[PDB]
Amino acid sequence: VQKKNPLRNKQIMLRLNPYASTFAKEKLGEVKAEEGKPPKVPASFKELLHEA
């Protein structure tokens, strides 16, 4: 009878996508990056970046 937007209506989004509840509860839009010591930029890369 009328088209209801799933971006604005939470009930329509759960009708079309039942994982939208688990997406919000587990905060899958806010996943942190994996751990690890980030290794430095190699010196050859910086010299080419500032070559001229």
Binding site: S44, L48, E51, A52
Partner: protein, 126 residues
């Protein structure tokens, strides 16, 4: 050169012979032979007016006509697919028998060793 009624010919219009030469619109054309005479060949060509195509009949001599190979790609494919299909059924795996358009290139890495990049100015001074 021997021509048969019904084959596909290409009109080139050589400038050595001024007899039997068609118009410049019919130069560099391609049509189907409907009539063969002693020295001239009648070729049916297509010409577009606004949206449709009006078929026109022109008499072109032997010195301006040559065979084409546009069909030859189609018959080359019809045997190549035939042998491939028989060879596929012989050992029993499917093969993509179609030709597909060129796809975007996949990801790859390029090493910088031995190929250090050269910097270039907008205009060359040397």
């Amino acid at each position: 050169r021997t021509y048969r009624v019904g084959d596909i010919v290409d009109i080139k219009v050589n400038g050595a012979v001024q007899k039997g030469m068609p118009h410049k619109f019919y130069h560099g054309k391609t049509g189907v032979v409907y009539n063969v005479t002693k020295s001239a060949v009648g070729v049916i060509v297509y010409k577009r007016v606004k949206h449709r195509y009006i078929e026109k009949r022109i008499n072109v001599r032997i010195e301006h006509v040559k065979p084409s190979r546009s069909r030859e790609d189609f018959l080359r494919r019809v045997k190549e697919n035939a042998e491939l299909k028989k060879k596929a059924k012989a050992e029993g795996v499917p093969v993509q028998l179609k030709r597909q358009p060129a796809m975007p290139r996949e990801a790859h890495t390029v090493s910088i060793a031995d190929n250090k990049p050269v910097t270039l100015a907008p205009v060359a001074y040397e």
